[PDB]
Every structure is written in C-alpha cells, then in structure tokens.
Design a protein around this ligand. Structure first.
Ligand SMILES: [Zn+2]
Ligand SMILES: [Zn+2]
Lengths: 69, 19, 304, 48, 44, 98
C-alpha cells in the first residue's frame, strides 16, 4: 500500500527513496535502472523494492469519511 | 517469426562489494 | 602446533575503504569458524535502539495502528546504544521504563485542507497541509536526566525522509513510541547493519599461456580490472582478484576449458559492512569482536 | 525496445486522479459485458 | 459529537431515545467517531 | 545455569564429558569447537544443537589423557579470548594507520 521502510531481504532503508524515485522518473527523463542506481540501490533485492512498489495508498486516500465529497 | 526484442543499453550492474 | 602467537604472526587486516556508513576491509589467515562468528554477531547480537512500545492516542488515517507501529519500529534511530541501559522485563509496566533506558518519541500531525491551493492542482503537498508524515516528524521528548545527557546529541532518525504515513483533511495521528535497547536476533528492527557479510578472495589460476587475440577475449570474460595484457609479452595475467565477481563466464567457452582454474583463498575474507545509521561500521565490527570475547569470558567464569 | 514496462508514472498519476471521461481499462468491462447486456436487453432494445 | 454522517460526513451528536438520522441531510447511516484513547501496540 | 555438565555422559576419570550451554548457537559453538581442536591433547571434539527451536548447545570433548574435558574447555575458551584480543588490536592498529 505504502512504501516499505526497509528492504525485505537485506534490511536497507528504502522508505525514503520512493518520492525521489518518482521525481527522477518524472522531472529527469531517467529510465528505471538509472534512477535506481542513482538512488544508491545496487543489490537487486533493494532494487525490486522500489521498482515494483504499487503505491495503493493514494487510491485508498480518495475514500475519506471525514471530509465532504 | 521475429525474435523476441533484444533490450538495448545493457550495461554492467553487478560489482564486487566495496568497489 | 597452533598457538595464539602463531595466529598473531600471520593474521592481518587490509582496510579497503571506510565511511560513516560502509566499511570494506579484509581478514587474512583466519578461519571461517571465526569470520562467520563475527558476521553472525554483527547481524544478530550487536544491540541498537528501535521503537518497541507504541501508545496510540488517535489514528483516523488509512494506515491501521498495527501497521503504523510496525513502520515506526522499523525506522532506525541515531542513538548511541551505550547512552541507555537494558530494560528489565520482569519489572512491572509502571517502573519498567525509566530515563536511563527509554527514549520517548511523539508524533502529532493533523491534516487540514489548504485554502490557498490553485485550481487544477494535483500535488498533495499543495492541496493539503501535512498530507505526508515523515520520520523527521517524530519529535524527541526527553524526560529526566536525559534532558541533560542527550543535550549534546538530540535523537533523530538516521533517515528523516522515511515516508511514515499519508493523510487527508480531517485525519490525524497522535502517538507516543518508546524506544529501548534490543538485539537483532530477537527482532530484525534492532539489527544495526543494512547487511554485513564476507566473501572469499577469488583465485584465477592461469594454467597455459593465453597469448594473442585469445588474451583479448579471455580478459573480456571478467570484470574490467581483473585481467590485463602484459606490456612486454602479449600475455594475460591476474591484476586484481578482489575486482572479480565469480560468474564463471570463462568456463562457458571450450577455448579456455583447460586453460584456467577458478578457485578461492579459503582464509582471505573480504568483509563488506553497511550501517543502518546508528553506529559506524568500524564500531559495529569492533563491538562484534568484543561481544565474542565477552561471551567466551562469561563461559570461562561460569561455574560448572 | 523493452518487452514490457511497469508504467510507474502513468499508474501513480491515474491513482492520484481517476479519469473523468472513461476507465482506462476497456477490456475489464467487456468481461462483464454478457451480464450487463443481458440485464439491459429486458428493458431496452428493439420491440420494446 | 460522537457520530459522522455516512454521506455528508458532518459530525452530529445523537441523544438516546432519538431518531437515528443525520440532522443536515436525510441519511439513516451513522459512523461512530474514534475519540482519543490510549491503545498500546508492539512495533513488531 | 548457563553451563551444565551432563552427568549421564561424563566419564569417571573426567577425560570425556559433555556440556550443555544455554542461549548459544553455531556462532559460539563452531568457534569454540575449532579452537578446542587446536589442543594437541583432545581426541574428539564437536558441537550439536539438539533442536533449532531451542537455544541449547551441546559440546563434547574427549581427551587422550593427562587433562580433562573441563580443562580442555577452559583452554579453548581462553584461546578464543586471546584470538579475539589479537584481532581487535590488529584492527585498531590498521584503523589508526589508515
Ligand atoms: Zn536489499
Ligand atoms: Zn448527513
């Protein structure tokens, strides 16, 4: 749903890199491998954690029971 | 039949630890 | 015979690099029985500080309370583990936590809609106020003597940019997290290394000369700085073994099937250590060595 | 050329703002087209 | 104010022996609001 | 409580004992076994974990004679301590050198 704090396999903190990954994908015209490398993700265990994240939290957040729609 | 499209720009990604 | 002196004569350390997060070094003329002991202690036995007990006061966000507490337990904290003691679990909940072993973090954040947002704005940071909750929002609430002992170094996450949660207007989070000392063999959140491991130094025994164009392709079968062409004679030689990642691409050609043997130096360990952020990798290794020694000494002094 | 793509930016943009004309997955509706069309055929269509 | 209308999402207080409906609009579904209480957890 | 001598397996003269250690695993077991197998007086040495889900380590030491299994265990523990000390000192030397 929301980005995991750490990589499952090794434990490297990858929770602070999802927004940067999106920025490097959108603003810069970087491919996914280049963006992951420039974030500091060398092991494929760490690369998959960001390369394959879905970010369903944004779709969950549109159903807000506390604000008039 | 056309062969499966070979991806381009394939570089080295694996390096020995510490390098 | 084997002796501590005969080990001290031959053991040596070659630090290849050393940062505040990652330290790459070598242990030579040591046994896997001790290198693996060091690696296992680094991963599991060296203590660190992580959030353990979370006291929610309100959570109207989409993320549920147990998930949020798990995420808050995962974020690493820049606390020197020596600055606090160990929690005595047998004591009652009232007196269990004290100013010398517990660090109190709070997170109070309400989302309100931004009344100045432009029309057609899709950025949550422009549409809403506090639409994102980060680890940096985890304020440190010192209590007792730590108000003076931690004045030199306030407790902050090693990664303040960790996206803890997201919010929408009306939603809010109000919680307290108690951070204590623990080891990584109990829960993986207390592990102070992103990953600590080693690998034997590869050996590339060239058996027959590879003079000619064959040297160009043989050198092409390894990482770039592993094989070189000698200036004098057109011969391939092993420049740097440490640069080799053992992928056996040379074995996939029958040309070199009887010209090279790939092996290892069974005593030459290349330790690569990365730190989560609370401690430096060299101090992690030093603590693991000390832990092994102290546990052996405890066994020695234990009556049988 | 890449055989497949994750479509990360497109997916996250669509998650942020649902389309205002039509759903981006026409095939996901032809799957239930039999049931919808069968229930539709009993009130509309030719002959009343 | 301990209830939220399921459609207009306006906070409303429902007294006992009272009609269970939103006062603003005509919605008969109400959601209990979460009030501030201590709820311990393990960060595991 | 930490270290226990299994009386059902010990020898009368003390030259073949078996030790049960709590809260230990391969980390200490393998190091201690390797170090004890450096004593030229020990005949048999090994470690076993009865069940992985229990934190109990078993150490067997059989000596040729002239010592005991307890003495061999003490020697191996002290040798392990000295090995750790020399590793620490050499690491610090190279840190200061750099
Ligand atoms: Zn990883
Ligand atoms: Zn209403």
């Amino acid at each position: 749903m929301i980005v995991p704090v750490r990589c499952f396999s090794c434990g490297k903190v990858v929770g602070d890199k999802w927004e940067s990954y999106l920025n490097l994908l959108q603003e810069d015209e970087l491919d996914e491998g280049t963006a992951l490398s420039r974030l500091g993700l060398k092991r494929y265990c760490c690369r998959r954690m960001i390369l394959t994240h879905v970010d369903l939290i944004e779709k969950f957040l549109r159903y807000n029971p506390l604000e008039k729609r | 039949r056309k062969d499966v499209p070979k991806v381009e720009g394939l570089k080295l990604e694996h390096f020995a630890t510490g390098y | 015979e084997w002796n501590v002196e005969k080990f001290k004569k031959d053991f040596e350390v070659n630090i290849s690099s050393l940062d505040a997060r990652e330290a790459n070094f070598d242990l030579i003329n040591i046994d896997t029985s001790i290198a693996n002991a060091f690696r296992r202690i680094m991963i599991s036995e060296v203590p660190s500080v992580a959030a353990e007990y979370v006291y929610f006061f309100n959570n109207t966000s989409v993320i549920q309370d147990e998930v949020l507490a798990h995420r808050i337990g995962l974020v690493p904290l820049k606390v020197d583990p020596d600055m606090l003691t160990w929690v005595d679990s047998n004591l009652p909940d009232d007196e269990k936590f004290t100013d010398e072993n517990t660090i109190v973090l709070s997170l109070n954040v309400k989302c309100t809609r931004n009344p100045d947002a432009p029309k057609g704005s899709t950025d949550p940071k422009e549409l809403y106020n506090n639409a994102h909750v980060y680890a940096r929002d985890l304020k440190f609430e010192p209590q007792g003597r730590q108000s003076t002992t931690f004045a030199d170094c306030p407790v902050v996450p090693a990664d303040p940019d960790i996206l803890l949660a997201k919010l929408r207007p009306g939603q809010e989070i109000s919680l307290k997290a108690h951070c204590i000392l623990g080891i990584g063999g109990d829960h993986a959140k207390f592990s102070p290394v992103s990953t600590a491991s080693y690998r034997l130094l590869p050996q590339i025994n060239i058996l027959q000369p590879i003079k000619g164009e064959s040297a160009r392709r043989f050198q092409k079968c390894f990482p770039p700085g592993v094989i070189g062409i000698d200036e004098g004679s057109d011969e391939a030689y092993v420049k740097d073994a440490r640069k080799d990642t053992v992928s056996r691409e040379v074995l996939r050609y029958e040309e070199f099937a009887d010209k090279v043997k790939l092996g290892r130096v069974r005593n030459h360990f290349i330790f690569n250590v990365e730190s989560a952020g609370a401690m430096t990798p060299e101090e992690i290794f030093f603590k693991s060595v000390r832990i092994l020694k102290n546990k052996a000494e405890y066994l020695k002094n234990c009556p049988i | 050329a890449r055989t497949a793509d994750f479509r990360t930016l497109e997916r996250e943009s669509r998650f942020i703002n649902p389309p205002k004309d039509k759903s981006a997955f026409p095939l996901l509706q032809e799957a239930v087209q039999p049931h919808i069309g069968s229930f539709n055929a009993l009130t509309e269509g030719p002959d009343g | 104010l301990k209830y939220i209308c399921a459609e207009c999402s306006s906070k409303l207080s429902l007294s006992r022996t009272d009609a269970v409906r939103c006062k603003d609009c005509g919605h008969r579904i109400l959601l209990k609001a979460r009030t501030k209480r201590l709820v311990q957890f393990e960060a595991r | 409580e930490k270290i226990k001598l299994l009386t059902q397996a010990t020898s009368e003269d003390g030259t073949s004992a078996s030790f049960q250690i709590v809260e230990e695993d391969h980390t200490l077991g393998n190091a201690l076994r390797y170090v004890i197998m450096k004593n030229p007086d020990v005949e048999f040495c090994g470690y076993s974990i009865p069940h992985p889900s229990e934190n109990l380590l078993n150490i067997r030491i059989q000596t040729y004679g002239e010592t005991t299994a307890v003495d061999a265990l003490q020697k191996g523990l002290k040798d392990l301590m000295d090995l750790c000390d020399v590793v620490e000192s050499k690491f610090t030397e190279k840190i200061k050198s750099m």
